[PDB]
Structure formats: C-alpha cells, structure tokens
Amino acid sequence: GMAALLSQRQKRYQQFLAMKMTQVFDILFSLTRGQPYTETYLSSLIVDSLQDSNNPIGTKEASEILAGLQGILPMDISVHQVDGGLKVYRWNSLDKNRFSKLLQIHKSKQQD
C-alpha cells in the first residue's frame, strides 16, 4: 500500500545517494588538493559531471551530498563560512578505501 510505496522509493533513494556520494568523492579526488574550492564551483561541477536525462541530480542535491561527505570525512575535508555565508571546502590527502568503509558505517547508523 502507501506505506510500501513510501518505503520502496525511500530505499531506492538511499542507494542512489550513497552511489552519488562515492562519485562526488571521485570528483574531489581528481582535483588539485590543498587549495580552497567554493561550494558553488563544486556543486556545479558535480551536476555537470554526473547529470543525464535518466539520472537527474540538482544543485541542491549536489550541495547536500558534498556537505554529507565532509560530515563523514571531517578529518580529511574542512569547511569554512564567513558569518554564515558561502561554504568553502579544503582537503589535503583523501583515502578512498577509508571513505568507502566510513560510508557504509554512516549509512547503517542513519539506516541509509
């Protein structure tokens, strides 16, 4: 019924988001590390890199995914705002294998 419909769509979205977060990580990994990047640049880059007709991703989604990734990797990725303004991200070394493990753990805690 309705509860099943809500449940099923939510589960598909959980999978989608986790997939997208791993691609966002791949995108950050491809950039020159150790310099600031604005949220605006990174979110447009995520959308431009991953979007197609059949796999929509919007600016707001990309921004939240990026924020989630920093939240999971706070020891690797920093985020700063001046007076609640534009978010600016920085990182040095990133490790995908650690990230992949942390993602599954965080997904479990949230229940995906």
Numbering used by the authors: 493 to 604
What does the original paper state about this entry?
The process of eukaryotic DNA replication begins during G1 phase with the loading of the minichromosome maintenance (MCM) heterohexamer comprising Mcm2–7 subunits into head-to-head double hexamers with double-stranded DNA passing through the length of a long central channel. This topological loading requires the Origin Recognition Complex (ORC), Cdc6 and Cdt1 proteins. In budding yeast, Cdt1 forms a stable complex with MCM before loading. We propose that Cdt1 stabilizes a conformation of the MCM ring in which the Mcm2–5 gate is held open to allow duplex DNA passage required for helicase loading. To understand Cdt1–MCM at an atomic level, we determined crystal structures of two non-overlapping fragments of S. cerevisiae Cdt1 spanning amino acid residues 1–438 and 495–604.
The structure of Cdt1(495–604) revealed the C domain, which is highly similar to the analogous WHD domain previously characterized in mouse Cdt1. Further division of the C terminus of Cdt1 showed that fragments containing amino acid residues 271–496 and 495–604 interacted with both Mcm2 and 6, suggesting there are multiple interactions between Cdt1 and MCM subunits. Although the C-terminal WHD of Cdt1 could be accommodated in our EM structure, interacting with the WHD of Mcm6, we have not modelled this region using our negative stain data, due to the limited resolution. Our CTD-Cdt1 crystal structure can however be docked into the 7 Å resolution cryo-EM structure of MCM-Cdt1, indicating that the C-terminal WHD of Cdt1 interdigitates between the A domains of Mcm4 and Mcm6, in agreement with two recently published atomic models.
